[PDB]
Design a protein around this nucleic acid. Structure first.
Ligand SMILES: [Mg+2]
Ligand SMILES: [Zn+2]
Lengths: 726, 162
RNA sequence: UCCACCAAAGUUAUCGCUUUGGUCAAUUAAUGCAGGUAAGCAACAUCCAGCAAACAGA
DNA sequence: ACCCGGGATAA
DNA sequence: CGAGCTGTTTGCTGGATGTTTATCCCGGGT
């Protein structure tokens, strides 16, 4: 049988024993640091060698073994059996030590004492190798084509020819034909020549371009021939021999001021990332054991830390054949449990058949995927009065994302934003040695504070991110208590109050003690405060009781509680996945409720490419999720579907003028034409009263779904697309 | 009309008893919920609940048996129930009414008024009166503060129906 | 740099339209659905290319 | 002689 | 489909590959 793997998410606090929580946290942080350096240092090596000599054997060093040595060079440990090392290991270690001191000086880094780092290094280096291979196989061809276009000076030639022909008053069609004959065809000839490793014919490129092509080809071996005569196919077939060339390509891209792209994968996130934990890592780092753990004792070691009898760790899947194998991935807040069935021992609606099309009668749901309106859904039986219409909007899905983004924007300390702005002055994707070294130094100059702020969940917090800040409680209309922006609890008996404006002013500040007492009893608040801080806060509350009017106690309490204002970024990231899953399931439930359990879904053919000034969309993920839930989904072309009036098949127009939908652009661009409302050109289109014409007004999505229904009916009746929409 | 009683202890020392008269016929569901909480039929009730908010000359409040600070409490019908009716108004002192965080947000918390509250009419359901032990109510009130803080720990040690 | 869902009307299957009625787990909480207490279901890390927010520079 | 690490290798 | 040119952090969307466990022996201590 084939191998399949499933992942179950959960939280550390819900399954991890408290006594073993702290050992894990540090480990995560340590691993993250190493991994980060394991990227940067690696790049720092390559750029050092490639700039030093063009004959450097870069291709052979892209392997997990070399990355393992790079990772271990950052860890200090007692010397082992040196004479047992292999020749490849010796060469890798010598190459690393050649630049070890320089990299440490540049990055202001010191080796971390971490015994038993073999398994972590192996896993992280395997991930690094996979990332390198995936990046190259994916982007080498596209970047090579972009470089070829840049070398041919396609843009300059096209512009010059267009201007010259326009000066001569040539017709646009003739101009395009001449451009194709004189520009596009030679460019294709150059592409064909380069694809086969053969230099282009004389006159196609200038001397500088030919020299650059020769320099690029010098990266490959002289006698090496691309498999199947195509470089783009040889890259996938034999990627290992192109890595060096890829680097050179990047430089050539930077030669013509092309936008830099990340040729060398790097880890730049300051928030600690997920790391893999297995039986050996748990035994040697988390449990702090000092003896070998065999497979028989595999589950016993885990039992000492997590409850394997919980729902997450028990058997799952078809016939409960997917068993837990002692492998997890955790980033200090979230945890992913992996289950596997094997041991670790090493269509378009227009092209549907007659029966398929006719079996959906009375069940098709026509969906118009928009930008702001993610899904405008209508059923066949919908009428003017029986409006069986459903709208799933971008706001419903983006509620949590926008809330978290606004919270992060509002709670960002001045130091953090200033540090990010300063660090942004050095590019990272650039392959230039000097630029990369400058970026390394800049990151090293601000790494500590950023790591402290983003690692506030488990790392030590000392810096005062909110100096001279006083926090006062408030209650919203829904009787929810917030410190400044942190939810505390819902006061169900708040509204009952006497007449406002009492005689004694100090009562307003005295209510602060009651609010503080209410807040301090919350689990999510108490857990974030250590014993000493809680004692000091209680003493300050007693002092406030003694002298409520004194603001010094309130200021001291605010200074102490400033830790509570730090956001748990990893927790928010984990909660985002739960919110997305809940939204998907809510959408499925709503679809089944409104349109029935056995509803058939017809979705538009719009691809929704990522466009500027527009947020991303779940076009492909939406279809994948809908299919995963069992909904029969089919695609229908949107050609002319949103341009004709369903009532009389007449063209529509955008007539209304409305202020800018986005408030921030109103001051700059106040009024724009409407986009979701249209009027028909028939000019009667209705039993108009004749007072002001009153052309029938259509919602664009409604008209589109009506046209989809027309197309479906025509397909059912004649098995052919309507002539109007063909 | 069912009558219920509470035993009030300050700092562990009993200070008196208060007897309430419930509007069973006028406000059936609210009175039934209050009686159930008093007698603890559903395994929970006012027994041990503190008077977390006493404003002298204005009001006493209590009934939070899950948090003791006003953020808890639940009704027998669920977390909350809609407002039943407003056939009674805060016209005279000693009236017992339900505390809420807005319309249709009634829970287990209750409050006893010591002065007329015409401004609260139509916002909180009035469902009882104090028939005996109003002197004990004044004694409890004297232990309150304008901000609502109590000078001593006042709890409903026992509750029952007469 | 803002917008959660369900209905009525301006209205004509009428807008990031307006005026009203109804709903709220608020959240820097937690593995998510449902079943009512049992018993089933659910892929995740990394890297990279894009796009949105903040900042700074052209 | 006898044992306790802990690096390093390899399927 | 719909709204008006560079760098970092975050995130949202899209594409590609994986998801450990025995064995040897030299340094060191008693
Ligand atoms: Mg469409
Ligand atoms: Zn028309």
């Amino acid at each position: 049988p084939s191998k399949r793997v499933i992942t179950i998410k959960t939280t550390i606090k819900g399954i991890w024993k408290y006594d073993y929580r702290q050992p894990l946290y540090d480990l995560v942080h340590t691993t993250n640091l190493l991994v980060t350096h394991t990227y940067a240092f690696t790049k720092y090596i390559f750029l050092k060698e490639l700039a030093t000599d063009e004959n450097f054997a870069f291709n052979e060093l892209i392997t997990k073994d070399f990355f393992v040595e790079v990772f271990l060079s950052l860890v200090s440990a007692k010397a082992g059996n040196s004479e047992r090392l292999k020749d490849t290991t010796k060469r890798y270690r010598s190459l690393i030590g050649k630049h070890k001191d320089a990299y440490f000086e540049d990055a202001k880094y010191t080796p971390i004492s971490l015994a038993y780092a073999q398994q972590i290094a192996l896993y992280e280096c395997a991930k690094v190798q996979t990332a390198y291979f995936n990046n190259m196989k994916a982007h080498f061809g596209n970047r090579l084509r972009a470089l070829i276009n840049k070398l041919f000076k396609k843009k300059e030639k096209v512009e010059s020819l267009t201007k010259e022909m326009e000066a001569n008053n040539f017709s646009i069609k003739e101009i395009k034909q001449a451009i194709r004959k004189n520009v596009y065809q030679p460019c294709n000839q150059v592409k064909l020549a380069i694809t086969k490793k053969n230099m282009p014919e004389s006159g196609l490129l200038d001397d500088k371009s030919v020299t650059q092509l020769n320099e690029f080809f010098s990266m490959y071996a002289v006698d090496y021939t691309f498999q199947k005569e195509s470089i783009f196919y040889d890259v996938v077939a034999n990627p290992e021999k192109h890595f060096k060339a890829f680097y050179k390509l990047a430089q050539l891209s930077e030669a013509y001021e092309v936008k830099p792209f990340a040729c060398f994968p790097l880890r730049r996130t300051f928030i600690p990332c997920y790391m893999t934990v297995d039986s050996k890592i748990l035994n040697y780092h988390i449990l702090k054991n000092k003896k070998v753990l065999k497979m028989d004792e595999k589950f016993n070691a885990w039992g000492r830390v997590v409850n394997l009898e919980r729902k997450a760790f028990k058997s799952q899947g078809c016939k409960k054949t997917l068993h837990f194998q002692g492998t997890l991935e955790t980033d200090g807040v979230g945890v992913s449990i992996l289950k596997q069935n094997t041991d670790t021992n090493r269509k378009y609606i227009e092209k549907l058949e007659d029966a398929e099309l006719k079996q959906t009668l009375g069940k098709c749901v026509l969906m118009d995927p928009g930008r702001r309106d993610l899904l405008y859904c209508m059923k066949e039986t919908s009428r003017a009065d029986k409006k069986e219409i459903m709208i799933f909007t971008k706001n419903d899905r983006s509620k949590c994302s926008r809330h978290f983004r606004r919270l992060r924007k509002l709670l960002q300390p001045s130091q953090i934003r200033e540090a990010e702005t300063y660090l942004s002055g050095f590019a990272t994707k650039s392959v230039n040695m000097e630029k990369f070294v400058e970026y390394i130094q800049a990151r090293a100059s601000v790494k500590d504070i950023l790591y402290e702020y983003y690692g506030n969940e488990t790392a030590k917090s000392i810096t005062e991110f909110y100096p001279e800040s006083q926090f006062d409680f408030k209650v919203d209309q829904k009787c929810n208590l917030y410190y400044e922006n942190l939810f505390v609890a819902k006061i169900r008996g708040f509204y009952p109050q006497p007449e406002h404006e009492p005689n004694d002013i100090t009562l307003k500040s005295h209510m602060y003690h009651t609010y503080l007492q209410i807040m301090l009893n919350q689990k999510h608040i108490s857990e974030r405060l250590n014993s000493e801080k809680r004692r000091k806060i209680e003493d300050l509350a007693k002092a406030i009781l003694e002298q409520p009017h004194e603001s010094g106690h309130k200021t001291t309490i605010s200074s102490l509680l400033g830790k509570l204002r730090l956001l748990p970024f990893r927790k928010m990231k984990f909660s985002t996945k739960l919110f997305s899953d809940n939204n998907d399931r809510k959408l499925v439930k709503n679809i089944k409720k409104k349109f029935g359990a056995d509803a058939v879904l017809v979705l538009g053919n719009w691809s929704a490419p990522n466009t500027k000034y527009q947020d991303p969309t779940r076009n492909k993920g939406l279809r994948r999720m809908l299919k995963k839930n069992g909904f029969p989904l089919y695609l229908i072309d949107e050609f002319r579907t949103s341009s004709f009036c369903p009532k009389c098949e007449s063209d529509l127009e955008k007539f209304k003028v409305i202020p800018n939908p986005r408030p921030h652009n109103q001051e700059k661009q106040p009024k724009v034409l409407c986009h979701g409302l249209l009027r028909c050109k028939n000019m009667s289109c209705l039993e108009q009263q004749t007072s002001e014409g009153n052309q029938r007004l259509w919602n664009r999505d409604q008209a589109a779904v009506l046209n989809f229904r027309k197309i479906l009916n025509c397909l059912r009746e004649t098995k052919q697309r309507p002539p109007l929409f063909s | 009309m069912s009558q219920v009683y509470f035993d009030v202890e300050a700092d562990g020392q009993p200070i008196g008893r208060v007897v309430f008269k419930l509007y069973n016929d006028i406000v059936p569901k609210t009175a039934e919920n209050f009686r159930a909480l008093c007698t603890g039929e559903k395994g929970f009730g006012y027994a041990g609940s503190p008077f977390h908010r006493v404003i002298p000359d204005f009001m006493l409040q209590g009934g939070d048996f899950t948090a003791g600070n006003g953020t808890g409490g639940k009704s027998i019908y669920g977390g909350k129930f809609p407002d039943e009716n407003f056939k009674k108004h805060h016209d005279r002192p000693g009236l017992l009414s339900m505390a809420n965080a807005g319309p249709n947000t009634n829970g287990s918390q209750f409050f006893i008024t010591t002065v007329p509250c015409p401004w609260l009419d139509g916002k909180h359901v009035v469902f009882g009166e104090v028939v005996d032990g109003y002197d004990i109510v004044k004694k409890v009130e004297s232990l309150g503060s304008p901000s609502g803080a109590t000078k001593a720990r006042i709890v409903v040690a026992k509750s029952g129906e007469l």
